[PDB]
Design a protein around this ligand. Structure first.
Ligand SMILES: *[C@@H]1O[C@H](CO)[C@@H](O[C@@H]2O[C@H](CO)[C@@H](O[C@@H]3O[C@H](CO[C@H]4O[C@H](CO)[C@@H](O)[C@H](O)[C@@H]4O)[C@@H](O)[C@H](O[C@H]4O[C@H](CO)[C@@H](O)[C@H](O)[C@@H]4O[C@H]4O[C@H](CO)[C@@H](O)[C@H](O)[C@@H]4O)[C@@H]3O)[C@H](O)[C@H]2NC(C)=O)[C@H](O)[C@H]1NC(C)=O
Ligand SMILES: *[C@@H]1O[C@H](CO)[C@@H](O[C@@H]2O[C@H](CO)[C@@H](O[C@@H]3O[C@H](CO[C@H]4O[C@H](CO)[C@@H](O)[C@H](O)[C@@H]4O)[C@@H](O)[C@H](O[C@H]4O[C@H](CO)[C@@H](O)[C@H](O)[C@@H]4O)[C@@H]3O)[C@H](O)[C@H]2NC(C)=O)[C@H](O)[C@H]1NC(C)=O
Ligand SMILES: *[C@@H]1O[C@H](CO)[C@@H](O[C@@H]2O[C@H](CO)[C@@H](O[C@@H]3O[C@H](CO[C@H]4O[C@H](CO)[C@@H](O)[C@H](O)[C@@H]4O)[C@@H](O)[C@H](O)[C@@H]3O)[C@H](O)[C@H]2NC(C)=O)[C@H](O)[C@H]1NC(C)=O
Ligand SMILES: *[C@@H]1O[C@H](CO)[C@@H](O[C@@H]2O[C@H](CO)[C@@H](O[C@@H]3O[C@H](CO)[C@@H](O)[C@H](O)[C@@H]3O)[C@H](O)[C@H]2NC(C)=O)[C@H](O)[C@H]1NC(C)=O
Ligand SMILES: *[C@@H]1O[C@H](CO)[C@@H](O[C@@H]2O[C@H](CO)[C@@H](O)[C@H](O)[C@H]2NC(C)=O)[C@H](O)[C@H]1NC(C)=O
Ligand SMILES: *[C@@H]1O[C@H](CO)[C@@H](O[C@@H]2O[C@H](CO)[C@@H](O)[C@H](O)[C@H]2NC(C)=O)[C@H](O)[C@H]1NC(C)=O
Ligand SMILES: *[C@@H]1O[C@H](CO)[C@@H](O[C@@H]2O[C@H](CO)[C@@H](O)[C@H](O)[C@H]2NC(C)=O)[C@H](O)[C@H]1NC(C)=O
Ligand SMILES: *[C@@H]1O[C@H](CO)[C@@H](O[C@@H]2O[C@H](CO)[C@@H](O)[C@H](O)[C@H]2NC(C)=O)[C@H](O)[C@H]1NC(C)=O
Ligand SMILES: *[C@@H]1O[C@H](CO)[C@@H](O[C@@H]2O[C@H](CO)[C@@H](O)[C@H](O)[C@H]2NC(C)=O)[C@H](O)[C@H]1NC(C)=O
Ligand SMILES: *[C@@H]1O[C@H](CO)[C@@H](O[C@@H]2O[C@H](CO)[C@@H](O)[C@H](O)[C@H]2NC(C)=O)[C@H](O)[C@H]1NC(C)=O
Ligand SMILES: *[C@@H]1O[C@H](CO)[C@@H](O[C@@H]2O[C@H](CO)[C@@H](O)[C@H](O)[C@H]2NC(C)=O)[C@H](O)[C@H]1NC(C)=O
Ligand SMILES: *[C@@H]1O[C@H](CO)[C@@H](O)[C@H](O)[C@H]1NC(C)=O
Ligand SMILES: *[C@@H]1O[C@H](CO)[C@@H](O)[C@H](O)[C@H]1NC(C)=O
Ligand SMILES: *[C@@H]1O[C@H](CO)[C@@H](O)[C@H](O)[C@H]1NC(C)=O
Ligand SMILES: *[C@@H]1O[C@H](CO)[C@@H](O)[C@H](O)[C@H]1NC(C)=O
Ligand SMILES: *[C@@H]1O[C@H](CO)[C@@H](O)[C@H](O)[C@H]1NC(C)=O
Ligand SMILES: *[C@@H]1O[C@H](CO)[C@@H](O)[C@H](O)[C@H]1NC(C)=O
Lengths: 101, 119, 123, 440, 123, 123, 53, 43
């Protein structure tokens, strides 16, 4: 299972954000990140913690290989307000809510 | 690739609900289909997946016995039936499509079907 | 590159040969395209093998430029060497020797055999 | 002073893909068309070599799958198309000398066929298993694969017995075999040996239990691309074989029907004697010992103190819910709930009631059915369950128990249990190296 | 036998080459196995022919070990000869030089052509 | 012409070899005759390539008559050279030596490799 | 029709001709065909007069 | 006015998946794909 942290954080537009994804079992690189807009179905941005799915802007990036994974969006935008979910195999993680300060 | 689900449902406690998920735009034999439920204000939870190729299923240990997934190749749909509904099953159920067996990649998700279980 | 010296002078064309020598050779489903590809591969292989066999019969295998001990009858060509190698290319040279080529090959192989036998006599 | 020097024939290889032909020492698989293998196979052991094998990313398995499908199609092509059979059958239930386990499993269906003459009909009866007929709303039934695919009768002179085939790479290619007896299936292999042909792989078709396979040597092996992943089948290879006895006690009689010029349809006549359910028998003690051995080698990936539970298949078609196989010319679908009904915490035979189908939709291809003709007499079979194809249930509740249920259906997993140790490589005999020599 | 010296030292592996050199080459029915056998035969023939053509372009046809006149830039490999030929085999050698092969090949052929022309000048 | 010296003496048959050496190699539709022709072409190509590979392994590529440094055990044949090369042809010669061929071939290749290595030592 | 209970009849195709056109069986390169020119050759045994073709 | 009679609503009997049962089904055929036989009868 995942221990994605923090629960939420207030971030100004254009600021760099980081979301740790401390896992409980060896996940290697098979960790993906989903962006769920409020109400809309979740949308997948990063798979294998490095590669970027087509149609997703390059501002999104990921890292980590062991039991710790990081998610960064570099320059935040008003359309980046959503919830972000870790996903190793079947298990998802507690979401991270982005709030504009 | 488009995955259109069924219509928002309301069931009494103890009843069984059969959600559907029609998939089009891709060959309905190569990619597994998962059912991911989300409680209101809670994180995503995985229910189980089905291989449309031969109907092989694999359910989560929490929802095992109460859930059963089938497929219709001609109609091109995946059906999920949940039995013995209780109060906390009020949720939005999604059907995702795994791209590759390794590195579970839920490319396309359905619109969502809220099942409301209440008296 | 390939066939670049086609219009170049006889000597300059003879200077470069590897660039157009490598390109003489380079699942299976029996569809329309698969059978055509198989025929193309077999044809290329057999043409290269025929050319190499002709080269090796004359004792010139592995040599792009190989000399021979056979004489050259003046009937084949009375043109001087300077104009042949300085004001003329390989195409018209083949054109004005073509019908003679067929006999020269024979002389070639004969000489080789004789030479080979001579070697077996000397060594 | 140092210069280049070219060496031809150096032992250098790179992983590649090519066509591997067949060598063997009528049949559905064209064993006769295969080249004769050498009476004494030649295998060269290699010293101080490490190669990275990957059975799940192997290409030889895909080529074998394609070859088996192509051989099946080419064996089914020049034989009787059963399109006239897709007619409204008037069926009853057979009740003459049927036990309690086969109540209504066979149907006595009488129907009109075209005879060898175009303008004349023919009222003929036959016996169809309940799985091969669907009701239309004595009653009216129709063959199950009449609204999806065209049935081609399995051709009576061909044999389905798996004759071993050796996959030999062409000249200029070699096959590295991983002789490491502790090779889990994905990673470096310290002990690599070069060979030209495979060890006579039997094209055995089965879903839940790997039959007549190649066994491990040291202990039972658990292979999986990702044990943590729940979408990856877990192949289990036994070190000792577990015998399974298969039987169809019915004494079937084959009856020929002229459905056209030359074309003949082989139906099931009246069964002479007593009608009894086809069944399997596996030694209880041997199966329990093998399951214990599997659990012993299965707790390594999940740690000690964990509960290992084997339950039956969770759902799907008849191919994945039941151990499906083919022997004696007949296809059995055996309910293996007795085998996987155990929990493990840190003379008697398990009898499996099997069902028989004649409309076989092999290779999960919707659009090409297949009618296996009845086999005369009583069919008995003896096989070794070489391995299992398990699947781990997903999710993670408070309990630490793990439940493994039989899987299958994808024959690539079936033929990956024989080609796991093999890899195909292309030789690169040209190599440049420093030397102090110059041409004169 | 075949590929027996794969893990053997560079010098020892270079000593024995014929045993793994012979095995580089060794009715028709259009069935599943027949087409595979035909493809295998054609593939083996064309691979052997490509290798022999590359050998013969560099003036090394018929020679398992052949020297060349082109220089070796130290950027390709700075490792000493003793460790190369005494504490290492051909595989890891191929891995570290695989990216400089093409240019080397070109140099090879160029020298041969130059060399060939020189004999045609001298002979 | 081709195979004309089959009954001729060993020396006379050895004198002429090119005439029966050239003839060792010389759209696509999968009809009966098309597939037969494709099989014939592939068979001829592979047989010629096998023969040339055997010749080149022994360091005799491009030479119809090639000598070797390996010894000849008297058990292979005790017949004198005069009668062998003057009162007998190639066929019965092949009949009485066909069972010593393989070992001979091995010796051949071994010598070549040794010789090649010696050359790499000397040059 | 006599062949209605044993085989399926395929009509002989009207534009094709059954006249036997002579065909020459040529061996591939690397093979030869020995023809026995002995005019008293009964069919099984040695042939003193052999000609390659 | 430009497509007066160019399309034909043709109803006809087809064999169904069962050999002994028929099926009365309609379709739309362009005028160039049907010729009259001498609603009317076309083929
Ligand atoms: C794992 O591996 C095992 C062992 O390799 C394998 O078990 C074997 O299965 C094969 C299935 O084909 C069995 O072969 C059949 O055996 C029966 C019985 O054989 C015994 O009895 C006969 C006399 O009745 C003896 O002569 C014989 O030596 C045995 O003692 C045979 O009756 C079968 O013959 C028919 O099929 C052949 C192949 O098609 C034909 O060549 C033969 O002529 C028969 O067909 C014809 O005759 C029929 C009756 O007249 C007629 O109805 C047909 O239409 C046709 O005209 C066949 O040989 C073999 O015995 C099994 N061996 C053991 C030890 O059990 C497992 O099946 C395998 N598991 C897998 C693959 O999952
Ligand atoms: C793996 O192992 C499990 C072990 O339980 C099997 O589960 C059993 O499957 C059988 C076969 O389907 C079930 O038997 C059927 O029961 C039906 C009624 O079930 C009701 O009650 C159960 C709880 O007891 C509920 O879960 C269920 O939803 C129903 O409310 C009957 O209607 C069926 O009758 C049919 O067969 C009989 C046979 O004689 C005929 O007479 C009838 O006319 C009709 O055709 C049938 O009896 C059984 O209930 C299941 N057990 C449980 C606990 O659920 C799996 O099937 C097995 N999986 C495999 C082998 O793949
Ligand atoms: C089959 O055998 C394989 C080889 O033994 C197994 O692969 C190894 O599995 C172990 C345990 O699962 C892994 O150990 C972990 O290693 C990581 C560090 O990762 C290292 O390897 C990766 C490979 O990409 C590399 O990129 C990193 O930089 C590291 O060098 C540790 O952090 C963990 O704590 C743990 O020790 C091995 O990494 C892994 N190796 C390889 C090459 O995959 C495989 O798991 C076996 N499969 C089964 C089903 O048993
Ligand atoms: C070919 O014919 C078969 C048999 O008639 C078809 O399978 C059947 O398809 C129907 C739907 O058209 C299924 O009905 C459904 O049953 C479920 C319960 O299982 C019920 O909840 C639904 O409301 C619906 O009524 C039927 O079960 C199914 N039968 C089997 C044995 O699978 C098949 O679809 C046909 N092929 C086609 C149309 O391409
Ligand atoms: C299946 O049904 C057929 C036809 O009803 C049975 O065959 C006939 O059974 C009657 C019984 O009175 C006999 O008189 C006939 O001689 C049988 N043959 C024919 C061609 O009519 C057959 O016995 C049934 N099979 C069962 C019940 O197993
Ligand atoms: C074979 O064909 C015959 C004739 O079409 C069927 O017999 C008819 O069945 C219908 C429906 O029951 C009756 O209305 C007719 O009176 C019957 N005619 C005759 C001459 O019997 C017969 O049922 C068909 N066979 C089967 C097995 O259905
Ligand atoms: C499979 O096992 C069953 C049960 O152990 C065997 O059934 C017995 O079979 C004998 C032989 O016909 C009968 O005399 C007994 O009455 C049967 N007993 C029961 C309880 O069924 C069966 O023979 C075995 N068959 C095979 C092929 O292994
Ligand atoms: C499966 O069947 C085989 C025989 O087909 C059984 O093994 C033989 O059993 C007989 C009877 O006791 C012995 O005489 C033989 O010594 C046994 N071994 C052989 C023939 O190799 C076997 O026990 C059965 N397995 C089951 C029922 O699980
Ligand atoms: C597979 O076999 C198991 C046990 O051998 C069957 O389970 C029994 O099914 C019957 C039929 O409904 C029930 O009456 C029993 O209560 C069940 N017992 C147990 C322990 O599960 C199962 O139904 C079979 N599955 C099939 C035939 O599809
Ligand atoms: C072509 O003709 C068919 C005749 O079946 C028309 O389809 C029917 O039209 C009637 C009109 O009253 C409806 O009641 C039926 O429901 C229709 N369907 C069937 C199956 O009968 C069809 O509309 C015509 N198409 C045209 C004129 O474009
Ligand atoms: C489909 O077949 C039916 C029955 O063969 C046709 O209906 C018949 O039409 C003829 C011609 O007018 C009548 O004489 C019969 O009385 C009709 N029989 C029945 C049972 O209706 C029908 O016309 C066919 N369909 C089409 C489109 O031609
Ligand atoms: C899954 O397997 C692949 C290939 O063997 C490997 O690269 C990856 O690290 C594995 N992941 C886990 C979580 O075991
Ligand atoms: C025939 O068997 C079926 C089950 O396949 C059953 O539903 C039906 O009632 C039976 N009819 C009888 C016994 O008359
Ligand atoms: C699990 O228990 C076995 C003994 O049954 C032991 O050999 C092994 O080291 C244990 N594994 C652990 C403690 O991780
Ligand atoms: C099956 O029936 C045939 C013919 O009656 C008989 O010869 C044979 O012995 C029977 N087999 C069994 C196992 O009863
Ligand atoms: C596998 O089964 C066959 C046939 O029953 C048998 O001959 C063979 O000995 C079995 N394998 C082993 C390892 O015993
Ligand atoms: C139907 O259309 C055709 C032209 O395709 C025409 O000749 C005929 O008169 C029309 N029949 C009517 C309008 O009744």
């Amino acid at each position: 299972p995942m221990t994605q942290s923090p629960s939420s954080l207030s971030i100004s537009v254009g600021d760099r954000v980081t979301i740790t994804c401390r896992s409980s079992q060896y996940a290697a690189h098979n960790v993906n990140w989903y962006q769920q807009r409020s109400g809309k179905p979740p949308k997948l941005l990063i798979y294998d913690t490095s590669k970027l799915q087509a149609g997703v802007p390059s501002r999104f990036r990921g890292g980590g290989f062991g039991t710790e994974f990081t998610f960064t969006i570099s320059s935040l935008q008003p359309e980046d307000v959503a919830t972000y979910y870790c996903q190793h195999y079947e298990f998802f993680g507690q979401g991270t809510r982005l709030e504009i300060t | 690739v488009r995955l259109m689900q069924s219509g928002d449902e309301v069931k009494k406690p103890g009843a069984s609900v059969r959600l559907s998920c029609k998939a089009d735009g891709y060959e309905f034999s190569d990619y597994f289909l998962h059912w991911v439920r989300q409680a209101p204000g809670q994180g995503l939870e995985w229910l189980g997946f089905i291989r449309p190729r031969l109907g092989s299923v694999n359910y989560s240990k929490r929802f095992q016995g109460r859930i059963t997934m089938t497929r219709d190749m001609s109609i091109n749909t995946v059906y999920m039936e949940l039995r013995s509904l209780t109060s906390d099953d009020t949720a939005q159920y999604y059907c995702a499509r795994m791209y590759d067996t390794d590195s579970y990649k839920f490319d396309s998700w359905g619109w969502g079907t809220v099942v409301i279980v209440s008296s | 590159g390939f066939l670049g010296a086609a219009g170049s002078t006889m000597g300059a064309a003879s200077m470069t040969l590897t660039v157009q020598a490598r390109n003489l050779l380079s699942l299976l489903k029996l569809t329309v395209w698969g059978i055509k590809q198989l025929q193309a591969r077999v044809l290329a292989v057999e043409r290269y093998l025929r050319d190499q066999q002709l080269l090796g019969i004359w004792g010139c295998s592995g040599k792009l430029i190989c000399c021979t001990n056979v004489p050259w009858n003046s009937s084949w060509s009375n043109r001087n060497l300077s104009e042949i190698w300085d004001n003329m290319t390989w195409l018209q040279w083949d054109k004005e020797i073509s019908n003679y080529t067929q006999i020269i090959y024979g002389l070639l192989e004969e000489s080789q055999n004789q030479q080979e036998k001579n070697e077996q006599d000397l060594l | 002073n140092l210069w280049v020097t070219v060496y031809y024939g150096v032992p250098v290889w790179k992983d590649a893909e090519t066509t591997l032909f067949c060598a063997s020492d009528h049949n559905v698989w064209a064993t006769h068309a295969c080249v004769p293998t050498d009476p004494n196979p030649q295998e060269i052991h290699l010293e101080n070599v490490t190669e990275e094998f990957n059975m799940w990313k192997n290409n030889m398995v895909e080529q074998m799958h394609t070859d088996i499908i192509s051989l099946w199609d080419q064996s089914l092509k020049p034989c009787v198309k059963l399109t006239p059979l897709c007619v409204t059958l008037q069926c009853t239930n057979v009740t003459n000398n049927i036990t309690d386990d086969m109540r209504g499993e066979l149907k006595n269906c009488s129907f009109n066929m075209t005879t060898e003459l175009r303008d004349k009909k023919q009222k003929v009866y036959s016996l169809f298993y309940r799985l091969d007929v669907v009701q239309i709303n004595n009653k009216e039934y129709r063959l199950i694969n009449c609204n999806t695919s065209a049935i081609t009768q399995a051709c009576p002179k061909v044999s389905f017995e798996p004759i071993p085939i050796h996959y030999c790479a062409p000249a200029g290619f070699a096959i590295l075999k991983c002789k490491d007896k502790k090779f889990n299936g994905t990673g470096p292999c310290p002990s690599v040996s070069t060979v030209q042909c495979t060890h006579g792989i039997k094209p055995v078709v089965s879903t839940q239990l790997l039959l007549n396979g190649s066994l491990a040597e040291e202990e039972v092996m658990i292979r999986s691309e990702n044990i943590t992943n729940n979408a990856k089948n877990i192949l289990v290879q036994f070190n000792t074989p577990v015998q399974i006895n298969c039987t169809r006690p019915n004494n079937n009689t084959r009856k020929s029907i002229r459905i056209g010029p030359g074309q003949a349809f082989y139906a099931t006549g009246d069964i002479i004697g007593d009608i009894r359910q086809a069944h399997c028998n596996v030694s209880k003690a041997t199966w329990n010992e093998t399951l214990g051995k599997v659990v012993k080698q299965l707790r390594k990936h999940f740690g000690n103190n964990t509960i290992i539970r084997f339950a039956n298949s969770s759902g799907g078609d008849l191919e994945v819910t039941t151990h499906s196989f083919n022997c004696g010319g007949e296809f059995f679908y055996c309910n293996t709930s007795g085998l996987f009904n155990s929990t493990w915490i840190s003379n008697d035979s398990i009898t499996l009631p099997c069902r028989i189908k004649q409309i076989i939709n092999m290779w999960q291809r919707i659009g090409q059915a297949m009618y296996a003709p009845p086999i005369q007499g009583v069919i008995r079979c003896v096989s070794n369950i070489t391995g299992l194809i398990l699947t781990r249930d997903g999710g993670s509740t408070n309990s630490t128990t793990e439940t493994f249920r039989p899987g299958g259906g994808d024959m690539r997993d079936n033929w990956r249990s024989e080609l796991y140790k093999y890899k195909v490589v292309k030789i690169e005999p040209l190599g440049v190296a420093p030397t102090r020599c110059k041409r004169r």
